[PDB]
Design a protein around this nucleic acid. Sequence first.
RNA 1: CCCCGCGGACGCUACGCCGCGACGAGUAGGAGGGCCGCUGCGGUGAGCCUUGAAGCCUAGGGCGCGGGCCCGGGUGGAGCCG
RNA 2: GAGGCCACGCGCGCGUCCCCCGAAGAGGGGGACGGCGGAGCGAGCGCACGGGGUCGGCGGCGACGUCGGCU
RNA 3: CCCCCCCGGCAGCAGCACUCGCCGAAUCCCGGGGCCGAGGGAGCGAGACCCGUCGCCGCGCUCUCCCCCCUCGGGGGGGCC
Lengths: 240, 225, 52, 63
Amino acid sequence: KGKPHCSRNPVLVRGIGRYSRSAMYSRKAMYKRKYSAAKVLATVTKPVGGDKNGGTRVVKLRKMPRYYPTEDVPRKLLSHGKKPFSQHVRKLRASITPGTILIILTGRHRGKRVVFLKQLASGLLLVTGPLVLNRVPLRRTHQKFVIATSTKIDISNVKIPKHLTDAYFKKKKLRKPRHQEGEIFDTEKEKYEITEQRKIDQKAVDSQILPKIKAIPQLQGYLRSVFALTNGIYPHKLVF
Amino acid sequence: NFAELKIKRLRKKFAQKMLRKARRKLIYEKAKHYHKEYRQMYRTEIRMARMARKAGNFYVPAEPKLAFVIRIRGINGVSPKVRKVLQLLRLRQIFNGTFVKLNKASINMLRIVEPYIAWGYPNLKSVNELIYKRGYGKINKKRIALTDNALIARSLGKYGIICMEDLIHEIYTVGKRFKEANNFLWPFKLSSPRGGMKKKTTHFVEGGDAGNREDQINRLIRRMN
Amino acid sequence: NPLKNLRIMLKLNPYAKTMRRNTILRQARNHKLRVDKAAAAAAALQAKSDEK
Amino acid sequence: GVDIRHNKDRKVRRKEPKSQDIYLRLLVKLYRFLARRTNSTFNQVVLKRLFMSRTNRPPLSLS
RNA sequence: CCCCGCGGACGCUACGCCGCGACGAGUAGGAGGGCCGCUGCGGUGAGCCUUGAAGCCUAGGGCGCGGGCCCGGGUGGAGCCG
RNA sequence: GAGGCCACGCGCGCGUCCCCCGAAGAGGGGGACGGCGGAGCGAGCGCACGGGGUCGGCGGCGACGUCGGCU
RNA sequence: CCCCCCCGGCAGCAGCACUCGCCGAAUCCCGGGGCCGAGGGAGCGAGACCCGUCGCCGCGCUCUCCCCCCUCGGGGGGGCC
Ligand SMILES: [Mg+2]
Ligand SMILES: [Mg+2]
Ligand SMILES: [Mg+2]
Ligand SMILES: [Mg+2]
Ligand SMILES: [Mg+2]
Ligand SMILES: [Mg+2]
Ligand SMILES: [Mg+2]
Ligand SMILES: [Mg+2]
Ligand SMILES: [Mg+2]
């Protein structure tokens, strides 16, 4: 075997390489790389033991089904696309760059102005309008439901902790093991608890974002306020 | 004989793959040659007109030999002679299109159906847009979309037409086998003209849409499909 | 649709890839030339105005 | 709307025997298979004759 | 010479099932299909029924393009349907 | 002689053309093209504008008050 | 101000100083909104066995060897006659 190489055919447009068939033939040196000519055990033998039980037993793995349904469904055709969500390419709007002030449009933090940090692996934005300013913790949000404003702070050379991932922010549930019929109320644990780790992470990020917020005048007052539509103003005439 | 039959199937499969590979290289090179031919024709008309103007003369181009005919009126209240000619042009529906080879016999047919059609002289782009987007073949009396080259080759390969490019070359440059290649194409089912028409009930030269617009048929085609 | 789907067009017309590749390469070369030609004109305009 | 005429769309022909003879229907089944799965035009002619009425299947004298 | 595996979906009431393409106005009139409907006869359902038939009623649940049909509830009181 | 393109890439022998000496302009030595000549085989990973949609993505809410029922 | 010059020179050029066209084998790239997802056994191969990531088409790497630039083995490039 040999070490893998880069593509040697730069892309210039999606689906079209920069070099032709003969150009890539010479780049690959295909003139000298010419080739003409030169498992899993389903059953296992196990010593059964015991006198006059024979020697061993040819025990097979994956025994045949005990039961068959009265009728089945035919298998699907093949689609040559339709990747799973984890393999989708994640797209981010050009107006959303790290440090941009965003406006939340949905949720309990509706209308608040927060600070954008990074896009996560699922494409959800990680924001923290710092908790001391407008009570928005380190929290995920969707880029489709935010407004990217023009004002930005340079949050370069700040250290977002690496464990802050999609798995970190994914919701946790309790119900429902060891319980089938509800005769005693299972309303306990409905109080979500803020982990000490989440408080530590909130303090760590905000300790290095807050000094940069105070660097420009009355930005903290801007972040403390909420966005609203006055009767005179129209969102299509507003420069954000 | 299990080993020998495997070798037979491998040799047969490899022979078929080489034949497909050779036929793809022929198709690639014919399109390269057609591209050379198209630009030679385009430059030649420019060159001929330039040498005429240099000498103070006039270069009259060849009269166009290909027309694209679009039926623009419906099927209600049509006189029997106009009704017959539209059927002979394969235009039995409104906004149907068909390439027509121009000569004395065909032009005099176009004069009869003049209030009912809009036609003109398609350029190379218009032919490509029509065949690629809306090209359907009449294969076994069925309207089959031209999604694979093997559909053209099985019906027109005896005439040398084996690909989309060959079909376009035969339509554009009206070849020996234009009748077979044109009749192979199902008449084009175009949409309504986006942006509207001017006036379908009068002639083009009097502010309407009927009749022969010379090369403005390409403007119509872009809006039509 | 061909003319919208690249691989469908390449299935029908394999030469469409080299025409498209040549067009993209040519248009980038022409665009670079017009950019550099215009910058030289502005540079000459600046030089002929601030020549001292 | 399309300018066509629909009076000749349906071709009038026997697609099967009008008879309910089960022995005739069995050998129609046999010759329906042989017409489909062979290139013999003989089997095609015999199949369509099996569909025909008695007046379209006149007797053949020995002479 | 298949065999560490002894194994491998569905289908084809052929009067069935499957694929592709085009098409769909309609009086008088013609034709086809009707697992639309009514009554009676020969067969058949080891059919249904006083632990409730027919009929009727119903802001009950549905099916069919439709003709119509099935089921629930009530009333009824001896027959009825595929 | 201080760039660009090619859907050009095994040998041997045969042909066609070009080059050298050409000691009969003989006879050999070299390039290019070939659609010519009796003899088997590439595999191994991937990416996808590729014979009609999937997620190996997720959230909230649920018993005497609400959930669904286009009829 | 107009015309003819003995003749023009420079830039730009159907102009990103929005005066007046026809076009694209002389045409490509990218983005946004809307509606839709019909179909369902595509395996000549192992003699399939986890639900055929399959055909046509377009590509990349390896079964050759050197380097170059970042990470700390991984990633990105030049090729190699
Ligand atoms: Mg009228
Ligand atoms: Mg409009
Ligand atoms: Mg009129
Ligand atoms: Mg219609
Ligand atoms: Mg009719
Ligand atoms: Mg009708
Ligand atoms: Mg009537
Ligand atoms: Mg221009
Ligand atoms: Mg589906």
